[PDB]
Write an enzyme that holds these catalytic residues in place. Sequence first.
Site, PDB file in Angstrom:
ATOM      1  N   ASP A  35      -7.761   4.368  -9.641  1.00 30.43           N
ATOM      2  CA  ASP A  35      -7.213   3.694  -8.264  1.00 30.43           C
ATOM      3  C   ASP A  35      -8.259   2.909  -7.526  1.00 30.43           C
ATOM      4  O   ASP A  35      -8.155   1.758  -7.078  1.00 30.43           O
ATOM      5  CB  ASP A  35      -6.550   4.728  -7.385  1.00 30.43           C
ATOM      6  CG  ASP A  35      -6.301   3.909  -6.193  1.00 30.43           C
ATOM      7  OD1 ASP A  35      -7.144   3.552  -5.190  1.00 30.43           O
ATOM      8  OD2 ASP A  35      -5.030   3.505  -5.861  1.00 30.43           O
ATOM      9  N   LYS A  61      -8.731  -1.224  -6.932  1.00 31.73           N
ATOM     10  CA  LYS A  61      -8.780  -1.781  -5.728  1.00 31.73           C
ATOM     11  C   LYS A  61     -10.143  -2.523  -5.910  1.00 31.73           C
ATOM     12  O   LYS A  61     -10.308  -3.506  -4.830  1.00 31.73           O
ATOM     13  CB  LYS A  61      -9.144  -0.528  -4.840  1.00 31.73           C
ATOM     14  CG  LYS A  61      -7.538  -0.130  -4.423  1.00 31.73           C
ATOM     15  CD  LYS A  61      -7.562   1.141  -3.440  1.00 31.73           C
ATOM     16  CE  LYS A  61      -6.120   1.561  -3.226  1.00 31.73           C
ATOM     17  NZ  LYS A  61      -6.175   2.770  -2.337  1.00 31.73           N
TER      18      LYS A  61
HETATM   19  N1  LIG Z   1       1.269   5.382   1.030  1.00 36.07           N
HETATM   20  C1  LIG Z   1       0.093   4.683   0.723  1.00 36.07           C
HETATM   21  O1  LIG Z   1      -0.665   5.084   1.698  1.00 36.07           O
HETATM   22  C2  LIG Z   1      -0.193   3.604   0.076  1.00 36.07           C
HETATM   23  C3  LIG Z   1       0.818   3.031  -0.789  1.00 36.07           C
HETATM   24  N2  LIG Z   1       0.512   1.750  -1.435  1.00 36.07           N
HETATM   25  C4  LIG Z   1       1.377   1.140  -2.211  1.00 36.07           C
HETATM   26  O2  LIG Z   1       2.843   1.451  -1.924  1.00 36.07           O
HETATM   27  C5  LIG Z   1       3.702   1.232  -3.000  1.00 36.07           C
HETATM   28  C6  LIG Z   1       4.682   1.871  -2.782  1.00 36.07           C
HETATM   29  O3  LIG Z   1       4.533   3.347  -2.265  1.00 36.07           O
HETATM   30  P1  LIG Z   1       5.513   4.239  -1.976  1.00 36.07           P
HETATM   31  O4  LIG Z   1       6.609   3.813  -1.056  1.00 36.07           O
HETATM   32  O5  LIG Z   1       4.920   5.663  -1.502  1.00 36.07           O
HETATM   33  O6  LIG Z   1       5.748   4.911  -3.575  1.00 36.07           O
HETATM   34  P2  LIG Z   1       7.433   5.397  -3.796  1.00 36.07           P
HETATM   35  O7  LIG Z   1       7.237   6.405  -4.640  1.00 36.07           O
HETATM   36  O8  LIG Z   1       8.223   6.059  -2.583  1.00 36.07           O
HETATM   37  O9  LIG Z   1       8.190   4.194  -4.571  1.00 36.07           O
HETATM   38  C7  LIG Z   1       9.023   3.291  -3.705  1.00 36.07           C
HETATM   39  C8  LIG Z   1      10.356   2.962  -4.361  1.00 36.07           C
HETATM   40  O10 LIG Z   1      10.129   1.881  -5.335  1.00 36.07           O
HETATM   41  C9  LIG Z   1      11.524   2.112  -6.163  1.00 36.07           C
HETATM   42  N3  LIG Z   1      11.277   1.156  -7.240  1.00 36.07           N
HETATM   43  C10 LIG Z   1      10.663   1.187  -8.519  1.00 36.07           C
HETATM   44  N4  LIG Z   1      10.858   0.468  -9.295  1.00 36.07           N
HETATM   45  C11 LIG Z   1      11.869  -0.320  -8.708  1.00 36.07           C
HETATM   46  C12 LIG Z   1      12.642  -1.389  -9.422  1.00 36.07           C
HETATM   47  N5  LIG Z   1      12.252  -1.676 -10.549  1.00 36.07           N
HETATM   48  N6  LIG Z   1      13.603  -1.928  -8.568  1.00 36.07           N
HETATM   49  C13 LIG Z   1      13.922  -1.424  -7.356  1.00 36.07           C
HETATM   50  N7  LIG Z   1      13.222  -0.426  -6.726  1.00 36.07           N
HETATM   51  C14 LIG Z   1      12.121  -0.021  -7.690  1.00 36.07           C
HETATM   52  C15 LIG Z   1      11.562   3.526  -6.454  1.00 36.07           C
HETATM   53  O11 LIG Z   1      12.910   3.783  -6.548  1.00 36.07           O
HETATM   54  C16 LIG Z   1      10.920   4.246  -5.300  1.00 36.07           C
HETATM   55  O12 LIG Z   1      11.578   4.936  -4.405  1.00 36.07           O
HETATM   56  C17 LIG Z   1       2.821   1.498  -4.271  1.00 36.07           C
HETATM   57  O13 LIG Z   1       2.534   0.265  -5.178  1.00 36.07           O
HETATM   58  C18 LIG Z   1       1.639   1.841  -3.826  1.00 36.07           C
HETATM   59  O14 LIG Z   1       0.415   1.755  -4.636  1.00 36.07           O
HETATM   60  C19 LIG Z   1      -0.558   0.881  -1.001  1.00 36.07           C
HETATM   61  C20 LIG Z   1      -1.817   1.382  -0.554  1.00 36.07           C
HETATM   62  C21 LIG Z   1      -1.794   2.843   0.114  1.00 36.07           C
HETATM   63  C22 LIG Z   1      -2.727   3.702  -0.566  1.00 36.07           C
HETATM   64  O15 LIG Z   1      -4.008   3.385  -0.184  1.00 36.07           O
HETATM   65  C23 LIG Z   1      -2.850   4.122  -2.343  1.00 36.07           C
HETATM   66  O16 LIG Z   1      -2.073   3.727  -2.774  1.00 36.07           O
HETATM   67  C24 LIG Z   1      -3.819   5.274  -2.381  1.00 36.07           C
HETATM   68  C25 LIG Z   1      -3.456   6.631  -2.355  1.00 36.07           C
HETATM   69  N8  LIG Z   1      -2.348   6.908  -1.477  1.00 36.07           N
HETATM   70  C26 LIG Z   1      -4.898   7.024  -1.717  1.00 36.07           C
HETATM   71  O17 LIG Z   1      -4.461   8.298  -0.832  1.00 36.07           O
HETATM   72  O18 LIG Z   1      -5.870   6.952  -1.741  1.00 36.07           O
END
Ligand SMILES: NC(=O)c1c[n+]([C@@H]2O[C@H](COP(=O)(O)OP(=O)(O)OC[C@H]3O[C@@H](n4cnc5c(N)ncnc54)[C@H](O)[C@@H]3O)[C@@H](O)[C@H]2O)ccc1[C@H](O)C(=O)C[C@H](N)C(=O)O
Lengths: 358, 358
Positions: free
Chosen positions: B218, B222
């Site tokens: 990851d 990034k």
């Molecule tokens: N929660 C965070 O802090 C965080 C998350 N994100 C990004 O946010 C996005 C979503 O995160 P999150 O809600 O937690 O994951 P979820 O698992 O809750 O996924 C959201 C929803 O997407 C839906 N889905 C998937 N495919 C679909 C489709 N084809 N059609 C319709 N719906 C669909 C699924 O049903 C799921 O419920 C990801 O791409 C993730 O990489 C971006 C940046 C940060 C973070 O820096 C990180 O990714 C790294 C890590 N958390 C770390 O701690 O270093």
Amino acid sequence: STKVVNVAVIGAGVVGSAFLDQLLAMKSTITYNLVLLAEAERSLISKDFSPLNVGSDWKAALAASTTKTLPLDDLIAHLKTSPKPVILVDNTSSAYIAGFYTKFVENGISIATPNKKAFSSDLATWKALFSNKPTNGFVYHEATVGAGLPIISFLREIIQTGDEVEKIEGIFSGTLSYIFNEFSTSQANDVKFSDVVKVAKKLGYTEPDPRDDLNGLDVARKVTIVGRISGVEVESPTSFPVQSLIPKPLESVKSADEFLEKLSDYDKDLTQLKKEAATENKVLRFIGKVDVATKSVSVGIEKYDYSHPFASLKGSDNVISIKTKRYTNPVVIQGAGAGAAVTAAGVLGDVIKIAQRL
Amino acid sequence: STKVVNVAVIGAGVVGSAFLDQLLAMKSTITYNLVLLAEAERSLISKDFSPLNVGSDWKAALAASTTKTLPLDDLIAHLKTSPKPVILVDNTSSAYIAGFYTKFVENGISIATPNKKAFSSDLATWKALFSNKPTNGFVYHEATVGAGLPIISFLREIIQTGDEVEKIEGIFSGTLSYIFNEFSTSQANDVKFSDVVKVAKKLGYTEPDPRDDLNGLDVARKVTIVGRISGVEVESPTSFPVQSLIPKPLESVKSADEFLEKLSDYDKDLTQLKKEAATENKVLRFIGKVDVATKSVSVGIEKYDYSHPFASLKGSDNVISIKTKRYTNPVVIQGAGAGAAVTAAGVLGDVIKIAQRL
Ligand SMILES: NC(=O)c1c[n+]([C@@H]2O[C@H](COP(=O)(O)OP(=O)(O)OC[C@H]3O[C@@H](n4cnc5c(N)ncnc54)[C@H](O)[C@@H]3O)[C@@H](O)[C@H]2O)ccc1[C@H](O)C(=O)C[C@H](N)C(=O)O
Ligand code: NA
Ligand code: NA
């Protein structure tokens, strides 16, 4: 075809020349048409509204001009007849020009500037920032607090997002930061206050009269701004504690030169306080503080620990720690809060943001 | 600015639910009409483009929906007819949805997302993404790195003004940042890597399988993003050194629970590294270096003097240093680079920026 925006610039000093350069060089899909430029009495006015014929040297162009600078009211009337949206880029620090901000705004003319004046005076002129009116342009002032660092925009963003700032504290003055980074460090230091400020002046970092930096009124201005956007309707830059670094007896002295010769006479205090903090393995910094909860605000000295973000700055960096509802741990943003190039990029970046909203 | 725009959100998970709440509850001069709430099997879709009548409790609405989620070729076929600009908000880590970005954009629909997929893919997608051709959606991804910290938008601005990045480098992973900030500190400690990895897991900083975090993958995607924003045409997150924290290979050979319990056999290596470096008044941090001149993007461990700010991070905060032609002395931005509400704010922050631009 291409979307165009006409720009009117006032001031071609250190910051203004950098801005003009960067502006005239900027590659983009939107067209930033330079229609006006004003420096002192000489001025370049494209009556036609075509791009100023600066050829390949606006300096000379500005030099050989014999078009006198338009009285402000006339500057609005003129700008008001443009075929495209106008963006005034006030590169001055004239509180005079600042007095027409709301007039410019109210006539559909937008503003981007590093000028702190209008933004850190009475609350009602600030309230005028409520340009929600349909007939007025936008007002952006990033370079107003921390040169070009992603600060005011980052606050406006999270705030709108739904976040709530709680406590904001930082270092908003280049000169003052440099002085304290050279004066109070982590290592053994026998440097006198008088000498650091004496040199900062020689390098050309302080204002012509360093007393204008030491009275901490410039940081108080920047603080006043951050405090407001943060929800603490600060009345004025003087309506709250601001510790002056100027020895009372040197407050009323003829020259900036008598000040420097005489200043040495008061290293005593700070030399001790600097030492004291050394014993506690701490450092000295000049900060601004905004506590949204208790609506308290202030600027002055404060000791910080070595592992603190504020003890690890380079050159003359500015710093701002942002604690909010969702940011239990501060977002702390740090970098140059002064310098032409850096600052102009801030003004221009606001130009970019505005031109897109137009 | 622009009065009315249509938001098409995909994914209502951790980030997604927070985004929705914040959007729905947002007060602005612009109207954001939710015309789509898509999930894995079911979607809310406003067939004629009226504001989805899902007041605040969309969950109940989504739940009762039996309208099957439209395949992306049909979806954009719908959205493309919208009487108002359309902002697609993709809140998934879906490579499937990512593969479609180029079509959204070409059909005139903008994108706001925290999905690293399309931006850490091949170079053609990236170029296509930012081809910035007329009447094509804009593509914002502030949340792909550093959650909602002002960095990507900061870089794209400084670059547009005319600044050039020379050396970027940061801690882009919260789980990793947490582990090291815990593992190696200034104050010598007798802590075992394995013990930190496992505690971080139990405390939820990790993914069910801590290898999903230790493979430094990851951090690679990034850095592939930032590298590109800076001028390094990285072929892929796997075209440069990416040191893994996984006990050398011995990867596929095991499985979830077993990996951990067997992990405490290599600690001696990292523990020794933590020691030697300590002798140099330094610390250990997992970073993503990016050198422009040499065009060298790497990932792995690096030493940092206690003085350094990478050395005093809080919780699991992210950090990024940015040296440029203008900022000869690095602009450091540190703060939560993960988190439901902070990540979502970053996404809604991009939405606001786009609506304002339309
Ligand atoms: N929660 C965070 O802090 C965080 C998350 N994100 C990004 O946010 C996005 C979503 O995160 P999150 O809600 O937690 O994951 P979820 O698992 O809750 O996924 C959201 C929803 O997407 C839906 N889905 C998937 N495919 C679909 C489709 N084809 N059609 C319709 N719906 C669909 C699924 O049903 C799921 O419920 C990801 O791409 C993730 O990489 C971006 C940046 C940060 C973070 O820096 C990180 O990714 C790294 C890590 N958390 C770390 O701690 O270093
Ligand atoms: Na700023
Ligand atoms: Na970010």
